[PDB]
Amino acid sequence: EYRIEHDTMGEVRVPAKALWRAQTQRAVENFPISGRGLERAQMRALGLLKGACAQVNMDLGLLAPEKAQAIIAAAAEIADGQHDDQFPIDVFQTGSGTSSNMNTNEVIASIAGANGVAVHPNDDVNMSQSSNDTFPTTTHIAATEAAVSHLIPALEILQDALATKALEWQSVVKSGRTHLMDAVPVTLGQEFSGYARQIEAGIERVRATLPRLGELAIGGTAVGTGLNAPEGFGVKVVSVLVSQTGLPQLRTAANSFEAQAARDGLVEASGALRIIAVSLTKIANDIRWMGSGPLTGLAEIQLPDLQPGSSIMPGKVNPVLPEAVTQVAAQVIGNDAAVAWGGANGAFELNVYIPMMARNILESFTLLTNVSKLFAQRCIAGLTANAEHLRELAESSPSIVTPLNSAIGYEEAAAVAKQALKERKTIRQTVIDRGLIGNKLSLEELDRRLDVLAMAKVE
Amino acid sequence: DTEYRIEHDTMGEVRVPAKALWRAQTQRAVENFPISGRGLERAQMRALGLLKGACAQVNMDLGLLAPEKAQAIIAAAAEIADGQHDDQFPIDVFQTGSGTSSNMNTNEVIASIAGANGVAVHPNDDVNMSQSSNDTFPTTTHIAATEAAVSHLIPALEILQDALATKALEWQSVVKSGRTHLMDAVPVTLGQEFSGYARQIEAGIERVRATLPRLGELAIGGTAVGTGLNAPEGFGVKVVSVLVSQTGLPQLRTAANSFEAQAARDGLVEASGALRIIAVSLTKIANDIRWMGSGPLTGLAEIQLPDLQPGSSIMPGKVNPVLPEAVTQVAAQVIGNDAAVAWGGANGAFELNVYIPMMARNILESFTLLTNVSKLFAQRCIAGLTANAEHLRELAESSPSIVTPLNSAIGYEEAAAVAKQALKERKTIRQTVIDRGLIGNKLSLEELDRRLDVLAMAKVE
Amino acid sequence: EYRIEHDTMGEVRVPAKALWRAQTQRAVENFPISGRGLERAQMRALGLLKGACAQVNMDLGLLAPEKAQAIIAAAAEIADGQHDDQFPIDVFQTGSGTSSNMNTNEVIASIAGANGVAVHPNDDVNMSQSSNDTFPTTTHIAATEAAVSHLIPALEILQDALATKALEWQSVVKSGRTHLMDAVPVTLGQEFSGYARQIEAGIERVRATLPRLGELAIGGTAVGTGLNAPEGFGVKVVSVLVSQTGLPQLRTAANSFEAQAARDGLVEASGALRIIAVSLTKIANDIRWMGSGPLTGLAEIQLPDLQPGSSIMPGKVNPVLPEAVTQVAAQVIGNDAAVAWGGANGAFELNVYIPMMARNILESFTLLTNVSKLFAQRCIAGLTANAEHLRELAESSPSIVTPLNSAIGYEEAAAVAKQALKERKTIRQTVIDRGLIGNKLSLEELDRRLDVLAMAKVEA
Amino acid sequence: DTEYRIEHDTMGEVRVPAKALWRAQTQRAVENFPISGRGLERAQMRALGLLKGACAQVNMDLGLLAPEKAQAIIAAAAEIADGQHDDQFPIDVFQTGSGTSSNMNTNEVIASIAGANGVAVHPNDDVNMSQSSNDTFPTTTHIAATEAAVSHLIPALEILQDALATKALEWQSVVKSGRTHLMDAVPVTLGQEFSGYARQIEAGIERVRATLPRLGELAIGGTAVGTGLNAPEGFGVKVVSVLVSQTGLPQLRTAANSFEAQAARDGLVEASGALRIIAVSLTKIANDIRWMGSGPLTGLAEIQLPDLQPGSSIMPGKVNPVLPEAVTQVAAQVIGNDAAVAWGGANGAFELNVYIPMMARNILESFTLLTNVSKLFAQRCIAGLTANAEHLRELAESSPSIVTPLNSAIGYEEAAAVAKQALKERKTIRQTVIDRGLIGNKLSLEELDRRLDVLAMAKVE
């Protein structure tokens, strides 16, 4: 069954039980493109913002209290997730988010009406607002919340897991590799201190975006001038948003025209996630190479078994968490290109790529948050080192000749390494065989310098 | 709900939701990869069902799989292919990069369906007989992508090409000013411009078709590493024959090289690259159309787009080019998806590229978005455009560059002085040519008028 | 003619007058790929770093003063650009920069030898060093210098030019446009204040990368452990570098393994340039659209003529500086993808994409620096506004009905706007014709609300 | 030198360096675009010279340009095409996006050369007769790109394909352990892996060839906006005939649609996309090769790469895989260049895409990098690889996954227990099968040894 609703273009048949109205239904028919709509966090921010705007409009005497309280109560239901099935509009809608803004206005109107209070979706629920400031405001609320409350705490869990291994393995000597070739000794702990620093720097990179990611366009209305909103509307709404979210990073935009003509802060936020994707690729690739084998690979560490590896090769177990991490990183890199493409292509007073940009930046936050915690807890925490094998690798590298450079010179040290490899002799015995024990190098000094744990220079 | 049953695999016991048709390995993957909250698409589960039925058919034909087991597997696989069990595939896209988990998801659900019908089949020994995830999962990916290209995207692009070509003919004499660098140029017709858009989409179809010889290559039969170990001789060729008969897609074929087909996913990178060009073309077409529709009074106002919904929650009565916005946002998504596909494609190792589920998600999404938005763009926007022909002819006549056909008579430098003086003095080109004393042995008044006619200047063919 | 030099792989024929030696010549033959090598700024940083390392090795008593002074003098010649033609190696060399490191070591050895001092390219000129810490150090020196001393000052020039127009045009009313459609009034000044903020925020974005862009790997030697360098070598060398460059943004890396296993700071710096490319695309596109015409476009502003526009259409002039800007932005976006691709693909103790990453990040700094200044000085500064045309456009938008929403309601205001367009009437006359003057809207209030300059709500 | 002479264009007089062969408009562009400090490449100036000569030839054939003038332009254009005047093209890549400046650069230098030979020709009226920048500059870009693809890149890829295919044959029986997910898998041969690499390069050639029908499309004849205004009937067809005769490239053709050919550069996006796939393939090949050469003692040590230079300024005697490093860095550059090309390609407006010089720079660079590094990779790395065959056969025999052929005899789950017990007790698969009491009616000792032979397991025949 259907019922008739109307907008300024005419009457529209709407499913009888739906809480949306005419403009949402038009958008259902105009944009059946991906079949996916707003995320939970986006509908939360829309509900939060519509409640805050009604509160301020009531505070200022522009909106009657009976109407404002009914809107506040309905918006709270939306923010809480009680009506997510009432937001059927595709991501790939009009690029201002007008349709999803009106979706929220219409659903609020229907909830309020069922409670005996008539509010107009435009005149009341959208009072003092445009899609052009509210929709990017909800996007930046959701992204700031994702960065502060979800991603950074997940990166902290991962940094801690890596740093714990850096400490546990501080004296687990192994052969360094550069260009994939035998190098001088390092410890596993040293390598994991590098990974931990990459994640720590990732947190610094996300934090550096927050002063502009947290900028909200609310109050600029149609074009940035604030037309049809009272003086200070944006400042007053942001104050309510900070109180409701506990996110002091939210703020009014430095320039109200920049905040609507562009979404540069979303490009910036995505760029930090892109670096984290780059860092995680290196960490996860190293960890699965360390776990490669057990007999045809490096066999440096053992990853926790998480599931049977193979439908055909029995007993084989694969590095599935590194695979999830590196695939997530690839997705973040692609999403980042989509965000930047949208960001560059604003025109005059409005960038109309907001729903697409919002989808991609919020997804990148979600993927990185979730996979970083899983990587920490289901992979890093349970790694074990094959320390005996690692020392054997360290002692087998021909590059352990390197600390002899100051005693015999680079060219002779190179001759030592090549002869040792050719004759399948040790560095120590080749140094002796080449007659190098003498005024420039004693046996005692040779053995001191070839000690691989000392050569790793553990701090 | 807290109701569970205990299933097991070679790794141990797992609690599984009591009503779920999946079993231990799927449940492990549910707990290992809660990353995006989104799993396989309908088309991926369709291809998994189709492939598992085809493998059972061939194993049975060869006498390797008992007919009673084969019947139960074929019937269960058909239910999956038909979409009766999509809620039984809970595994994230961001799973192990071979698709082992979704392969085992299919094997386990088939075993549960067959068991409910009174036939015991083993998910590994029977449902996965002669198979690996490493050949079956990219096979289902290339089936789904080939089907998307041939049966969905190309028909949608044909609809859009036809709508653009129809306007190219309808508007073949609707003269307007060309614009180059956004500046007044010489006359064109709207129809000429739309013939260009139509060619871009026609070329886009050519680009998709050019990918099909390699997009349609399937790894099936190569099993674990490409050698076909534990598969019967010619198993993959026989399975592809079933797949071709079942899908009606002659583009499906065994891979030229069985190692290339598992060590790499270069065919998906190739297919994505064609979609990327289409995104590039659509961006130009959609941008031109919304600029031509800009206004009503402060823009170019060359054409009118069909109204599709109220434009604005605050500015009353305003209507916006929402379909060009959907197109250009889809194009941005395809560009990003394409970068993700190429990133995964480059990073295979030895016998297997383990980025398949991510690559699959992105290529299939790009196919879906372009298919759906191209049809909407054609039918809800292009088909109903109207032209503001009087305004367009005035624009054509107003460009100072209509002096251009006089180059051979008065020379480039004098023609430039004509154009600059006409604009400064707010005079027509014709009157400025007269005022500068250029009418004479080199240029008659009748010749001037012939050369300045803007419709003739568009050289409509 | 040729002479023989040797390395640990054997003897190599080297052009007789070349200052490089065996390992540089091998690299000439191994990597003829792009035909382009290190940039001036990269050879400057190599010379600076080799001089600083010799200074510290001498300070610590590890390198004899006669050798150290000869290396310092030779390295200064290289830093000053006296020997750029002695660096023939392709960008697309071994990904540690080993070849360019040895190029610098060999050229220094030859210069010192011609001055009568023998120094060994490995034992002396490379003392306490690896390619794996020195080459990324020189890259981060060059990139930090580019950010601080070249790009930020150029962006400040552009921000100032945009802000000056924001003030000059503070009250030049026009029609806003959203979705390319007629919107409510703005001023040209307000739009240019938005552009100025984008560039100001771009400077903030570059500044934010400096704490990690300025991290130097020097001292970590082969793998990050500092093997074969004295205690505190990196700290001592960075101190010399800071004193020599005046760039206290340069600093020792927080973690010596991160600083060699990855080049994440270059990815970060490129990402800031990518945002600036995104911002400049919007600014330049708006400016060329506002200049479009003269008679078939928006014709809001006049760009300074810079050159004849057209070889065929006579007297036509085109927005060439916006075109240069938007093409530079495209290049930065592509370079940025190359940098990130290299950044992700390190292995164990070393990322071996450094020469390629260095090329792309330094190019993006150069292009953005140079085009930002040209954009400011050859385009923005000389823009003129077509103020009467702009005022007419402001008055022509049907959306000037918007301030009546609180008096007549959204739905009636929409009917007013649609009827005004259909009948080719003003909003004011349509309001009157629809009988809306009354207890909800007086004629005086209608005229107060339809004032388009007041509707733009110019501040300050 | 500070001496100047006066030249002029339609904007006024310009001081030009006294000895420069360029004139007023080139000098303006020198001052307008000091951005990268790099200008056109050799191949771009060659194509400009070729095209200007062809246009003068056709204008002479049609009686539109006097033979003495046409001959002098043809001679000057040939001097430019052959490289005698490359220092007379000082304009930046990042110029006006139609290439107007480089077009006028060519027109002005030709006029000066002709004048020094005693023949007066006007840069616009004569040297640019029947032409626009908007058709000639993309025409020269597509000539250069088509030539790069056909005459340089494809032959270089054939050298690499041949090198890989030769190793596939040489190593067809060199058994080793497969690796999937980086973990021990079932046997393959090095030859099989290299047959996969060879197919990747063969497919890369197919991908480049597939772009040629549209890469070879030339805009010449469309002049300002695609209408052909101010060019004689059939001018483009006649010029293309000259270009095909002179270059020997039958792929050069008139564009299917003259508006698409100037409003967009979609064929450059398409050509770049094929190079992007080649970069993806080469990354996989080069990564595998440097991993196989990793060591000598702490890595996989499967093969030995030719020594090309000392590896390390500090670690003595170390040698590094420098050619795989060059390949993978070139691939990164191609990926980035490809993103730049697509960005420019999407952003045309109305009758002209004004990103041509930037797009030209990036596509032509990608062709050059891939051509040169593919040949070096083949000749300085692939051809000289040697295999460590004894070590490889030991790796093949060491993989616990060689239990796989026993699946049909003992079942997947019991085979898992065999592989697991073998690893725990450091015993062979064969011994573990005996120790678990599996020899009997289902599996004999002779059948076990047949199934465990690793070279037979690689299924080379």
Side-chain angles (χ1 to χ4, degrees), chain D residues 47 50 163 226 240 269 280 399 459:
Chain D
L50 169 70
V240 171
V269 179
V280 162
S399 173
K459 295 181 69 69

Side-chain angles (χ1 to χ4, degrees), chain A residues 177-182 289 291-296 310 312-314 316-319 323 341 344 393 396 402 405 410 414, chain D residues 179-184 291 293-298 312 314-316 318 320-321 325 343 346 398 404 407 412 416 419:
Chain A
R177 293 180 187 85
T178 60
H179 310 252
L180 310 183
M181 307 307 275
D182 299 352
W289 267 111
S292 61
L295 285 168
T296 73
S310 160
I312 178 172
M313 288 174 288
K316 186 172 181 290
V317 180
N318 296 315
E323 293 170 7
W341 188 281
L393 290 178
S396 73
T402 297
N405 282 358
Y410 174 90
Chain D
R179 293 183 184 82
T180 60
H181 310 254
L182 312 182
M183 307 306 277
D184 302 350
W291 267 108
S294 62
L297 282 154
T298 70
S312 165
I314 178 168
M315 292 173 284
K318 187 172 181 287
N320 293 320
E325 291 170 8
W343 188 281
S398 70
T404 299
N407 282 0
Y412 173 86

Side-chain angles (χ1 to χ4, degrees), chain B residues 159-389 391-425 427-440 443-445 447-456:
Chain B
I159 289 169
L160 178 59
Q161 181 192 332
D162 286 350
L164 296 166
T166 291
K167 289 294 172 281
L169 271 185
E170 286 171 339
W171 289 342
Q172 64 185 321
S173 300
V174 179
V175 69
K176 51 167 280 178
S177 187
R179 293 183 184 84
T180 59
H181 308 254
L182 310 184
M183 309 304 278
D184 301 355
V186 291
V188 303
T189 67
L190 272 175
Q192 286 170 336
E193 294 180 310
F194 275 75
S195 82
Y197 310 148
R199 172 63 196 153
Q200 291 183 272
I201 300 304
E202 184 180 48
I205 292 162
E206 293 167 8
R207 288 153 171 143
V208 175
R209 283 184 170 137
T211 72
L212 297 176
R214 290 166 295 280
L215 180 59
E217 292 188 41
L218 307 179
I220 187 68
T223 68
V225 295
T227 59
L229 184 72
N230 277 27
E233 180 167 10
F235 180 73
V237 177
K238 296 169 182 223
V239 168
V240 172
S241 296
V242 177
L243 297 172
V244 166
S245 173
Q246 287 309 296
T247 63
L249 295 169
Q251 302 84 1
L252 304 175
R253 65 180 74 182
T254 56
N257 183 281
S258 60
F259 303 93
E260 183 273 351
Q262 295 179 208
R265 295 266 60 81
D266 293 348
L268 303 181
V269 180
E270 178 177 349
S272 177
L275 305 185
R276 190 273 300 273
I277 303 160
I278 290 166
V280 159
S281 302
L282 284 173
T283 296
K284 167 64 161 58
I285 300 165
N287 274 339
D288 274 5
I289 285 163
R290 57 171 167 198
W291 265 111
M292 285 193 289
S294 62
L297 295 171
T298 73
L300 306 181
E302 298 201 338
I303 65 181
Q304 300 184 226
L305 277 62
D307 291 354
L308 297 181
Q309 52 184 47
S312 171
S313 72
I314 179 171
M315 288 173 290
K318 187 173 179 283
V319 182
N320 292 319
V322 301
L323 232 299
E325 291 167 11
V327 173
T328 55
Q329 283 176 104
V330 161
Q333 192 67 66
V334 171
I335 300 300
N337 289 4
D338 173 75
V341 172
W343 187 283
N347 281 299
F350 290 100
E351 280 53 76
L352 182 63
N353 179 302
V354 290
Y355 294 76
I356 313 172
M358 182 279 300
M359 294 179 75
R361 169 194 137 162
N362 280 277
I363 182 66
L364 293 177
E365 179 177 56
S366 293
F367 273 114
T368 295
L369 303 179
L370 289 169
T371 296
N372 293 338
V373 86
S374 291
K375 185 169 163 66
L376 292 161
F377 189 35
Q379 293 180 157
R380 304 186 77 86
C381 183
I382 304 302
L385 301 173
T386 62
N388 294 326
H391 173 56
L392 288 170
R393 182 174 279 269
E394 290 177 342
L395 292 180
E397 294 164 353
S398 301
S399 171
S401 290
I402 68 172
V403 75
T404 297
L406 305 186
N407 282 0
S408 69
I410 68 184
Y412 176 87
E413 294 195 23
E414 178 69 13
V418 166
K420 294 197 188 198
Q421 174 179 326
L423 190 70
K424 178 179 64 59
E425 291 175 2
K427 294 177 179 173
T428 67
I429 295 293
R430 181 187 196 271
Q431 189 58 51
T432 301
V433 171
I434 297 170
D435 291 347
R436 293 183 63 91
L438 291 172
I439 299 300
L443 182 67
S444 74
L445 197 59
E447 180 70 20
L448 178 62
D449 285 334
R450 282 190 294 269
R451 295 197 187 192
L452 288 185
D453 182 87
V454 291
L455 181 54

Side-chain angles (χ1 to χ4, degrees), chain A residues 11 25 35 61 88 97 189 201 220 230 323 330 369 379 400 403 406 426 435 453:
Chain A
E11 287 177 337
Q25 185 59 41
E323 293 170 7
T369 296
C379 185
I400 66 168
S406 70
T426 65
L453 179 59

Side-chain angles (χ1 to χ4, degrees), chain A residues 107-122:
Chain A
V107 169
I108 288 173
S110 298
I111 293 162
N115 284 318
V117 183
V119 296
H120 193 275
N122 298 90

Side-chain angles (χ1 to χ4, degrees), chain C residues 61-230 232-397:
Chain C
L62 300 177
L63 183 63
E66 188 187 36
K67 291 188 179 179
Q69 293 299 347
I71 290 161
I72 288 165
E77 296 183 10
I78 291 167
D80 184 57
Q82 295 173 33
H83 302 289
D84 280 12
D85 60 346
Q86 303 301 319
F87 290 80
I89 303 170
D90 211 282
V91 166
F92 294 93
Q93 65 182 260
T94 178
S96 56
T98 294
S99 289
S100 284
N101 183 36
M102 288 309 301
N103 196 165
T104 313
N105 290 330
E106 291 176 344
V107 170
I108 287 171
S110 296
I111 293 165
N115 287 321
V117 183
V119 295
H120 192 278
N122 297 89
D123 295 327
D124 297 316
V125 187
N126 207 64
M127 178 183 293
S128 311
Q129 302 156 62
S130 174
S131 309
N132 299 347
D133 59 346
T134 58
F135 189 75
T137 292
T138 66
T139 301
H140 283 252
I141 291 167
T144 300
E145 197 270 348
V148 167
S149 297
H150 299 274
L151 176 59
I152 283 171
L155 298 172
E156 287 170 333
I157 286 173
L158 175 58
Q159 181 189 337
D160 172 80
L162 296 164
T164 292
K165 285 294 173 293
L167 184 62
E168 289 169 347
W169 291 338
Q170 188 182 48
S171 296
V172 179
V173 73
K174 51 166 282 181
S175 185
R177 291 182 188 84
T178 61
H179 310 251
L180 310 183
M181 310 302 280
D182 300 358
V184 289
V186 300
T187 65
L188 260 189
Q190 287 169 333
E191 293 179 311
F192 273 77
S193 78
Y195 309 149
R197 172 62 198 157
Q198 292 184 273
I199 300 307
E200 183 181 48
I203 293 168
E204 297 168 3
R205 286 151 173 143
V206 175
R207 252 189 242 285
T209 73
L210 297 173
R212 289 165 297 281
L213 181 58
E215 277 193 343
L216 306 181
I218 189 65
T221 72
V223 293
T225 59
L227 184 66
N228 281 18
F233 185 74
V235 169
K236 296 170 185 300
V237 173
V238 171
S239 175
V240 172
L241 296 170
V242 167
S243 179
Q244 288 297 307
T245 59
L247 297 173
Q249 302 86 357
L250 302 172
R251 69 203 74 196
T252 56
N255 183 279
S256 58
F257 302 92
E258 184 270 351
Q260 293 178 209
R263 296 266 60 82
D264 292 348
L266 301 185
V267 179
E268 179 178 351
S270 175
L273 306 188
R274 191 273 302 272
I275 305 161
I276 292 169
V278 162
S279 298
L280 285 168
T281 298
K282 166 63 159 61
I283 298 167
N285 277 340
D286 275 8
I287 283 167
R288 59 169 166 200
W289 266 109
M290 283 191 304
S292 62
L295 293 169
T296 72
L298 307 180
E300 297 201 336
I301 65 181
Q302 307 287 153
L303 276 64
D305 292 352
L306 297 182
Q307 52 184 46
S310 169
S311 69
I312 182 176
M313 292 174 286
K316 184 172 181 287
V317 181
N318 297 317
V320 302
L321 230 301
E323 292 169 8
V325 170
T326 52
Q327 284 177 101
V328 162
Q331 193 67 68
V332 170
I333 279 142
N335 289 3
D336 174 76
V339 172
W341 188 282
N345 279 303
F348 292 100
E349 282 51 77
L350 184 61
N351 178 303
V352 291
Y353 293 75
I354 314 172
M356 183 278 303
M357 294 179 78
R359 170 194 140 164
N360 283 276
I361 184 58
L362 295 179
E363 184 184 44
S364 295
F365 272 116
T366 293
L367 303 177
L368 288 174
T369 296
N370 292 340
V371 88
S372 294
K373 179 167 173 286
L374 293 160
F375 191 30
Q377 297 178 332
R378 304 187 77 85
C379 186
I380 304 304
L383 303 174
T384 62
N386 294 324
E388 170 56 27
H389 176 53
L390 289 175
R391 188 200 64 74
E392 294 174 12
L393 292 177
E395 295 278 3
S396 298
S397 170

